[PDB]
Amino acid sequence: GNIILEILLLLITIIYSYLESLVKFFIPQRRKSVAGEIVLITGAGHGIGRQTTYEFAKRKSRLVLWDINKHGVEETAAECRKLGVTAHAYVVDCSNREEIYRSLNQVKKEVGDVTIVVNNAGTVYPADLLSTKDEEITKTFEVNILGHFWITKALLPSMMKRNHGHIVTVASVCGHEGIPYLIPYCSSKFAAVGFHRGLTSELQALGKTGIKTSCLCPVFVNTGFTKNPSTPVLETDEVVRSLIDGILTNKKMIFVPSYINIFLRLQKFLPERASAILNRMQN
Amino acid sequence: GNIILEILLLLITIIYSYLESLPQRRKSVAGEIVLITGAGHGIGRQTTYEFAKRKSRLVLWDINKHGVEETAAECRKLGVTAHAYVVDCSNREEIYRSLNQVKKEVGDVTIVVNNAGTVYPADLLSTKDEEITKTFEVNILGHFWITKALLPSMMKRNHGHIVTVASVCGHEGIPYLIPYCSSKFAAVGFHRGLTSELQALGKTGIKTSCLCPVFVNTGFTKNPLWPVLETDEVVRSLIDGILTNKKMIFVPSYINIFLRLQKFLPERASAILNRMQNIQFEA
Ligand SMILES: NC(=O)c1ccc[n+]([C@@H]2O[C@H](COP(=O)([O-])OP(=O)(O)OC[C@H]3O[C@@H](n4cnc5c(N)ncnc54)[C@H](O)[C@@H]3O)[C@@H](O)[C@H]2O)c1
Ligand SMILES: NC(=O)c1ccc[n+]([C@@H]2O[C@H](COP(=O)([O-])OP(=O)(O)OC[C@H]3O[C@@H](n4cnc5c(N)ncnc54)[C@H](O)[C@@H]3O)[C@@H](O)[C@H]2O)c1
Ligand SMILES: CCCCCCCCCCCCOCCOCCOCCOCCOCCOCCOCCOCCO
Ligand SMILES: Cc1ccc(S(=O)(=O)c2cc(C)cc(S(=O)(=O)Nc3ccc(C(=O)O)cc3)c2C)cc1
Ligand SMILES: Cc1ccc(S(=O)(=O)c2cc(C)cc(S(=O)(=O)Nc3ccc(C(=O)O)cc3)c2C)cc1
């Protein structure tokens, strides 16, 4: 039953996870400057996107804000002006491929070539698979993953030429494990994780060392995106603090909280029937 | 998170003794209505013959009219007259129209093997946006429409089997296949979510299986040297998994250990691997 092999792999995962916390704590990493960088933040009209925007504004980055909610993106750009940075706000629908391209040409003309992309815009329609609407399933994929492909394909050429860039994919713990009443959302978030993992490998194979990639995978955050969790509740400030620390230290996989990867790692040692029961309990 | 880390460990070692250290029963698929997508070649074609040998009622789907007809002809030689159809699994409306025809002519599908898949190998900047959309429409979106249509009958009877044919690319991203890996990650996520949702809905008699093989010699991608897998081995692992209700079927089975040892891949080995990846891309 590969029991000896599996006990040794369990101990290695545990020892490695322990050493990973030690290094995180005792060996502090150098943290880069994002000042002057052209930062595009999608879904910047609320929550994680709005707070992330303010962290870049504080660090004197050049900002390009995108969101479908015209009032929200304008409200974020107004607070950026108070923080000392005049942001370039646009109301762009990240589900639309043509709209993304048209708006990125406007960004090239008015602002310049984007250097850091935070693909934060996302959508969810909680329901059991048989109660879902097919239009909503398509929309979940168009925003949560297909939009990432079109924004990256458009901005990547300049980053490749310069061997300098940063692609931030905002995925979720739902990109690592599936949960009830969120099947299309988990599937689209798994695709976002896969996009980041593949992009990271391809840039490495192409020798584009200077183009960094980061993937944000937080647990339930109190932003109104969803009203209640599936399996503590995070505050937006903690997530943004972890995201900025990860971007500046070129962290590839940013779990929020950092230790949730221990749970995810240990679950790989369980049958799927057991892990599914596990993520459905409330003791 | 101390307490949950411990409940995970006690849970791991509990299932190590439950069925990991304990006369395996294999079910009968005779008389079952089996739908196999992408049945005109490779894995789908061989899987079809295994169900025909086990006296299952067969419904075959493929875009390639000649290939699906060739498979249905060999089924007749095996003793089963199959119902072959030319259906494009990327088209939501075509899937629904064809499934109404299957309901009228054959009946309610009991086992679904979502095997049809597509790939357009290229580095992200050389990909065609139509091909990126097509990769998602076939590899993941088609799984959603086929399942939503066939699931109600399986729910009513508490009996069924949803087989998701994903790939090792659903567990790790590889260069020059970013949209393909992203769509395969979504397929894995769909299976994981479906498994949890069925458990939450109390419909566990609808079993789920996810096939994740390494490179198979079927012509899906061109051959590069590196060990190659044969279609017969994959189909043998798939059938054994379906009959024994295996949820995660890696081919070969031990590639789950390889995925777990990725953090330990020596820098020298990564340099050779991402050197053969481009040596074969150039072909
Ligand atoms: N909230 C959580 O619990 C949670 C957890 C993990 C991951 N995430 C992810 O974090 C990201 C941000 O979510 P949030 O928690 O800040 O939610 P939020 O509701 O506060 O903000 C999301 C923003 O994205 C915008 N947006 C949605 N669709 C868009 C589109 N088509 N084009 C442009 N903008 C669009 C919305 O209008 C909104 O301003 C999402 O990708 C979400 O999946 C959220
Ligand atoms: N070949 C491998 O190396 C490999 C490895 C892991 C996983 N897989 C997966 O296994 C599955 C089967 O691939 P294969 O290796 O048997 O390849 P294959 O080329 O031999 O056969 C795939 C079949 O799917 C059909 N198909 C493609 N698009 C379709 C559509 N829109 N509608 C209906 N049918 C369609 C094709 O006509 C073909 O007959 C795919 O999902 C693939 O991603 C393949
Ligand atoms: C602190 C650490 C302790 C140090 C001591 C180390 C001792 C030895 C350790 C051994 C570790 C071995 O682990 C290997 C894990 O590998 C898993 C990596 O998975 C990543 C996926 O990448 C695989 C890519 O495949 C490479 C081959 O590419 C060619 C494939 O050709 C076939 C397909 O061709 C068509 C594709 O287009
Ligand atoms: C006991 C235990 C079980 C699971 C985990 S986990 O970190 O693997 C985990 C996995 C998912 C899968 C969801 C959640 S959740 O409860 O936070 N639920 C949500 C997570 C994300 C989202 C979203 O992105 O909208 C909406 C709910 C969490 C904590 C940690 C500890
Ligand atoms: C040294 C080493 C490295 C990786 C592995 S692995 O088993 O984790 C692995 C991971 C992926 C990620 C791909 C592959 S691959 O080389 O088989 N590549 C392909 C896999 C699937 C497909 C396809 O689905 O078409 C097309 C190529 C493999 C062996 C085992 C040993």
Coordinates of N, CA and C in Angstrom, one line a residue, chain A residues 26-143:
Chain A
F26 N 13.4 34.2 10.0 CA 14.8 34.6 10.3 C 15.6 35.2 9.1
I27 N 15.3 34.8 7.9 CA 16.0 35.3 6.7 C 15.1 36.3 6.0
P28 N 15.2 37.6 6.3 CA 14.3 38.6 5.7 C 14.8 38.8 4.2
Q29 N 13.8 38.9 3.3 CA 14.1 39.1 1.9 C 14.3 40.6 1.5
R30 N 15.1 40.9 0.5 CA 15.2 42.2 -0.1 C 13.9 42.6 -0.8
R31 N 13.4 43.8 -0.7 CA 12.1 44.2 -1.3 C 12.3 45.4 -2.3
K32 N 12.0 45.1 -3.5 CA 12.1 46.0 -4.7 C 11.3 47.3 -4.6
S33 N 11.6 48.2 -5.6 CA 10.9 49.5 -5.6 C 9.9 49.4 -6.8
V34 N 8.7 49.8 -6.6 CA 7.7 49.8 -7.6 C 7.4 51.3 -8.0
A35 N 8.3 52.3 -7.5 CA 8.1 53.7 -7.8 C 8.3 53.9 -9.3
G36 N 7.4 54.7 -9.9 CA 7.6 55.0 -11.3 C 7.0 54.0 -12.3
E37 N 6.9 52.7 -11.8 CA 6.3 51.6 -12.5 C 4.9 51.9 -13.0
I38 N 4.5 51.4 -14.2 CA 3.1 51.6 -14.7 C 2.3 50.4 -14.2
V39 N 1.5 50.6 -13.2 CA 0.7 49.5 -12.7 C -0.8 49.5 -13.1
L40 N -1.2 48.4 -13.7 CA -2.6 48.3 -14.1 C -3.3 47.4 -13.1
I41 N -4.4 47.9 -12.4 CA -5.1 47.1 -11.5 C -6.6 47.0 -11.9
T42 N -7.0 45.7 -12.3 CA -8.3 45.5 -12.7 C -9.2 45.2 -11.4
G43 N -10.5 45.5 -11.5 CA -11.4 45.4 -10.4 C -11.0 46.4 -9.3
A44 N -10.5 47.6 -9.6 CA -10.0 48.6 -8.7 C -11.1 49.5 -8.0
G45 N -12.3 49.2 -8.3 CA -13.4 50.0 -7.7 C -14.0 49.5 -6.4
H46 N -13.4 48.5 -5.8 CA -13.8 48.0 -4.5 C -12.9 46.9 -4.0
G47 N -13.0 46.6 -2.7 CA -12.3 45.5 -2.1 C -10.8 45.5 -2.2
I48 N -10.3 44.3 -2.5 CA -8.8 44.0 -2.6 C -8.2 44.9 -3.7
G49 N -8.9 45.1 -4.8 CA -8.3 45.9 -5.9 C -8.2 47.4 -5.5
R50 N -9.2 47.9 -4.7 CA -9.2 49.3 -4.3 C -8.1 49.5 -3.3
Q51 N -7.9 48.6 -2.3 CA -6.9 48.7 -1.3 C -5.5 48.6 -1.9
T52 N -5.3 47.6 -2.8 CA -4.0 47.4 -3.5 C -3.6 48.6 -4.2
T53 N -4.5 49.3 -4.9 CA -4.3 50.6 -5.6 C -3.7 51.6 -4.7
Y54 N -4.2 51.7 -3.4 CA -3.7 52.7 -2.5 C -2.3 52.4 -2.0
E55 N -1.9 51.1 -2.0 CA -0.6 50.7 -1.6 C 0.4 51.1 -2.7
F56 N 0.0 51.0 -4.0 CA 0.9 51.4 -5.1 C 1.0 52.9 -5.2
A57 N -0.1 53.7 -4.9 CA -0.2 55.1 -4.8 C 0.8 55.6 -3.7
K58 N 0.8 55.0 -2.6 CA 1.7 55.4 -1.5 C 3.1 55.2 -1.9
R59 N 3.4 54.1 -2.7 CA 4.8 53.9 -3.1 C 5.2 54.6 -4.4
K60 N 4.4 55.6 -4.8 CA 4.6 56.5 -6.0 C 4.7 55.7 -7.3
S61 N 3.8 54.8 -7.5 CA 3.7 54.1 -8.8 C 2.8 54.9 -9.7
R62 N 3.0 54.7 -11.0 CA 2.1 55.4 -12.0 C 0.9 54.4 -12.1
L63 N -0.4 54.9 -11.9 CA -1.5 54.0 -11.8 C -2.5 54.0 -13.0
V64 N -3.0 52.9 -13.4 CA -4.0 52.7 -14.4 C -5.1 51.8 -13.8
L65 N -6.3 52.3 -13.5 CA -7.3 51.6 -12.8 C -8.4 51.2 -13.8
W66 N -8.9 49.9 -13.6 CA -10.0 49.4 -14.5 C -11.1 48.8 -13.7
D67 N -12.3 49.0 -14.1 CA -13.4 48.4 -13.4 C -14.7 48.6 -14.2
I68 N -15.7 47.7 -14.1 CA -17.0 47.8 -14.7 C -17.9 48.9 -14.0
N69 N -17.7 49.0 -12.7 CA -18.4 50.0 -11.8 C -17.8 51.4 -11.9
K70 N -18.4 52.2 -12.8 CA -18.0 53.6 -13.0 C -17.8 54.4 -11.8
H71 N -18.7 54.4 -10.9 CA -18.7 55.2 -9.6 C -17.6 54.8 -8.7
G72 N -17.4 53.5 -8.5 CA -16.4 52.9 -7.7 C -15.0 53.1 -8.2
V73 N -14.7 53.0 -9.5 CA -13.3 53.3 -10.0 C -13.0 54.8 -9.9
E74 N -14.0 55.6 -10.1 CA -13.8 57.1 -10.0 C -13.5 57.5 -8.5
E75 N -14.2 56.8 -7.6 CA -14.1 57.0 -6.1 C -12.6 56.6 -5.7
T76 N -12.1 55.5 -6.3 CA -10.7 55.0 -6.0 C -9.7 56.0 -6.6
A77 N -9.9 56.5 -7.8 CA -9.0 57.5 -8.4 C -9.0 58.8 -7.7
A78 N -10.1 59.2 -7.0 CA -10.2 60.4 -6.2 C -9.4 60.3 -4.9
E79 N -9.4 59.1 -4.3 CA -8.6 58.9 -3.1 C -7.1 58.8 -3.5
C80 N -6.8 58.3 -4.7 CA -5.4 58.3 -5.2 C -4.9 59.7 -5.2
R81 N -5.7 60.7 -5.7 CA -5.3 62.0 -5.8 C -4.9 62.6 -4.4
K82 N -5.7 62.2 -3.4 CA -5.4 62.6 -2.0 C -4.1 62.0 -1.5
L83 N -3.8 60.8 -2.0 CA -2.5 60.1 -1.7 C -1.3 60.6 -2.5
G84 N -1.5 61.5 -3.4 CA -0.4 62.2 -4.1 C -0.2 61.7 -5.6
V85 N -1.0 60.7 -6.0 CA -0.9 60.1 -7.4 C -2.2 60.3 -8.2
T86 N -2.1 61.0 -9.4 CA -3.3 61.1 -10.2 C -3.4 59.8 -11.0
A87 N -4.4 59.0 -10.7 CA -4.6 57.8 -11.4 C -5.3 57.9 -12.7
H88 N -5.2 57.0 -13.7 CA -5.9 57.0 -14.9 C -7.0 56.0 -14.8
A89 N -8.2 56.4 -14.4 CA -9.3 55.4 -14.3 C -10.0 55.2 -15.6
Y90 N -10.4 54.0 -15.8 CA -11.2 53.6 -17.0 C -12.3 52.7 -16.7
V91 N -13.5 52.7 -17.3 CA -14.5 51.7 -17.0 C -14.4 50.8 -18.2
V92 N -13.7 49.6 -18.0 CA -13.5 48.5 -18.9 C -14.0 47.2 -18.4
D93 N -14.7 46.4 -19.2 CA -15.3 45.1 -18.9 C -14.3 44.0 -19.3
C94 N -13.7 43.5 -18.2 CA -12.6 42.5 -18.4 C -13.1 41.1 -19.0
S95 N -14.4 41.0 -19.2 CA -14.9 39.8 -19.8 C -14.8 39.9 -21.4
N96 N -14.9 41.1 -21.9 CA -14.8 41.4 -23.3 C -13.4 41.5 -23.9
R97 N -13.0 40.6 -24.8 CA -11.7 40.6 -25.4 C -11.4 41.8 -26.2
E98 N -12.3 42.2 -27.1 CA -12.1 43.4 -27.9 C -12.0 44.6 -27.1
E99 N -12.9 44.8 -26.1 CA -12.9 46.0 -25.2 C -11.6 46.1 -24.5
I100 N -11.0 45.0 -24.0 CA -9.7 45.0 -23.3 C -8.6 45.5 -24.3
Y101 N -8.6 45.1 -25.5 CA -7.5 45.5 -26.5 C -7.7 46.9 -26.8
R102 N -8.9 47.4 -27.1 CA -9.2 48.8 -27.4 C -8.7 49.7 -26.3
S103 N -9.0 49.3 -25.0 CA -8.7 50.1 -23.8 C -7.2 50.1 -23.5
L104 N -6.5 48.9 -23.8 CA -5.0 48.9 -23.7 C -4.3 49.7 -24.7
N105 N -4.9 49.9 -25.9 CA -4.3 50.9 -26.8 C -4.4 52.3 -26.3
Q106 N -5.5 52.6 -25.7 CA -5.8 53.9 -25.1 C -4.8 54.1 -23.9
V107 N -4.5 53.1 -23.1 CA -3.5 53.1 -22.0 C -2.1 53.3 -22.6
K108 N -1.8 52.7 -23.7 CA -0.5 52.9 -24.4 C -0.3 54.4 -24.8
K109 N -1.4 55.0 -25.4 CA -1.4 56.4 -25.9 C -1.3 57.4 -24.7
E110 N -2.1 57.2 -23.7 CA -2.3 58.2 -22.6 C -1.3 58.0 -21.5
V111 N -0.9 56.8 -21.1 CA 0.0 56.5 -20.0 C 1.3 55.9 -20.4
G112 N 1.3 54.8 -21.2 CA 2.5 54.2 -21.7 C 2.4 52.7 -21.6
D113 N 3.6 52.0 -21.6 CA 3.6 50.5 -21.5 C 3.5 50.1 -20.1
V114 N 2.4 49.3 -19.8 CA 2.2 48.7 -18.4 C 3.4 47.8 -18.1
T115 N 3.9 47.9 -16.8 CA 5.0 47.1 -16.3 C 4.6 46.0 -15.3
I116 N 3.6 46.3 -14.5 CA 3.0 45.4 -13.5 C 1.5 45.3 -13.7
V117 N 1.0 44.1 -13.8 CA -0.4 43.9 -14.0 C -1.0 43.1 -12.8
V118 N -2.0 43.7 -12.2 CA -2.7 43.0 -11.1 C -4.1 42.6 -11.7
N119 N -4.2 41.3 -12.1 CA -5.4 40.7 -12.6 C -6.3 40.4 -11.5
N120 N -7.0 41.4 -10.9 CA -7.8 41.2 -9.7 C -9.3 41.0 -10.0
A121 N -9.8 41.7 -11.0 CA -11.3 41.6 -11.3 C -11.8 40.1 -11.4
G122 N -12.9 39.9 -10.7 CA -13.4 38.5 -10.6 C -14.9 38.6 -10.4
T123 N -15.6 37.4 -10.6 CA -17.0 37.3 -10.5 C -17.4 35.9 -10.0
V124 N -18.6 35.8 -9.2 CA -19.1 34.6 -8.7 C -20.6 34.6 -8.6
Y125 N -21.2 33.4 -8.9 CA -22.6 33.3 -8.8 C -22.9 32.0 -8.0
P126 N -22.9 32.1 -6.7 CA -23.1 30.9 -5.9 C -24.4 30.2 -6.1
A127 N -24.3 28.9 -6.4 CA -25.5 28.0 -6.6 C -25.0 26.6 -6.9
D128 N -25.8 25.6 -6.6 CA -25.5 24.2 -6.9 C -25.5 24.0 -8.4
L129 N -24.6 23.2 -9.0 CA -24.5 23.0 -10.4 C -25.8 23.0 -11.2
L130 N -26.9 22.3 -10.8 CA -28.1 22.2 -11.5 C -29.0 23.5 -11.4
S131 N -28.7 24.4 -10.4 CA -29.4 25.7 -10.3 C -28.6 26.8 -11.0
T132 N -27.4 26.6 -11.5 CA -26.6 27.6 -12.2 C -27.2 28.0 -13.5
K133 N -27.0 29.2 -14.0 CA -27.4 29.7 -15.3 C -26.1 29.6 -16.2
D134 N -26.3 29.0 -17.4 CA -25.2 28.8 -18.3 C -24.5 30.1 -18.7
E135 N -25.2 31.3 -18.7 CA -24.6 32.6 -19.0 C -23.7 33.0 -17.9
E136 N -24.0 32.7 -16.7 CA -23.2 33.0 -15.5 C -22.0 32.1 -15.5
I137 N -22.1 30.8 -15.9 CA -20.9 29.9 -16.0 C -19.9 30.5 -17.0
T138 N -20.4 30.9 -18.2 CA -19.6 31.5 -19.2 C -18.9 32.8 -18.7
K139 N -19.7 33.7 -18.0 CA -19.2 34.9 -17.5 C -18.1 34.7 -16.4
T140 N -18.3 33.6 -15.6 CA -17.3 33.3 -14.6 C -15.9 33.0 -15.2
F141 N -15.9 32.3 -16.3 CA -14.7 32.0 -17.0 C -14.1 33.2 -17.8
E142 N -15.0 34.0 -18.4 CA -14.6 35.1 -19.2 C -13.9 36.2 -18.3
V143 N -14.3 36.4 -17.1 CA -13.7 37.4 -16.2 C -12.5 36.7 -15.4

